[PDB]
Design a protein around this ligand. Structure first.
Ligand SMILES: N[C@@H](Cc1ccccc1)C(=O)O
Length: 192
């Protein structure tokens, strides 16, 4: 499959997707690409981001399919990874990904963390996995970001000063997406 759109799945919280963080700027930049689309919608259950709510929304309302690049931020990165356990997607770009509820009640209530990660299913369903992470992220232990990188064999873009990626512009992400639009050579991953 060749990629036809990106979908931004944001972090949890009530910020309007179009005007909060980098989502709107990235959408606008991607929409400059001739023939390309970028969907970004306010999510149902935006505060707790329940798996049982976000994943059906991603399927039916964001139309996430084998021609989609899913760009997931924080809770949205988590949702992207669970989505890829059961759906083929073109690529996933994970910004501030992690693996556990980090002892947070709102994270636990999401349902994303109540069983192990099906890393092999994700790798099988998604041929291109790119990851952004920052060592100074105030929410995430580096070890959990590293766990995602190791288990999904991601192409890791490791920064020291981006925190939880909450700035308004994100050029490095545009570059990544444009690189994926060329349908780059498949890299060797380990499938079990
Ligand atoms: N998941 C939150 C960030 C967060 C991570 C871990 C614990 C608490 C909060 C977000 O989407 O922004």
């Amino acid at each position: 499959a060749s990629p036809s759109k990106a979908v931004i799945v944001p972090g949890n919280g009530g910020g309007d997707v179009t005007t909060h963080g980098w989502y709107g700027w990235v959408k606008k930049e991607l929409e400059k690409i001739p023939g390309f689309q970028c969907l970004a919608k306010n999510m149902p259950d935006p505060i707790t981001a329940r798996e049982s709510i976000w994943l059906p929304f991603m399927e039916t309302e964001l139309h996430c399919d084998e021609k989609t690049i899913i760009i997931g931020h924080s809770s949205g990165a988590i949702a992207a990874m669970r989505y890829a356990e059961t759906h083929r997607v073109y690529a996933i770009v994970l910004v501030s990904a992690y693996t556990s509820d980090l002892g947070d009640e709102n994270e636990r209530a999401s349902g994303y963390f109540t069983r192990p990660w099906q890393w092999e299913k994700i790798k099988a369903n998604c041929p291109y996995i790119v990851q952004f992470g920052s060592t100074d992220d105030p929410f995430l232990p580096w070890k959990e970001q590293q766990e995602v990188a190791d288990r999904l064999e991601t192409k890791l873009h490791k920064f020291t000063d981006c925190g939880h990626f909450q700035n308004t512009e994100f050029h490095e992400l545009i570059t990544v997406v444009k690189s994926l639009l060329k349908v780059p050579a498949l890299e060797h991953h380990h499938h079990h």
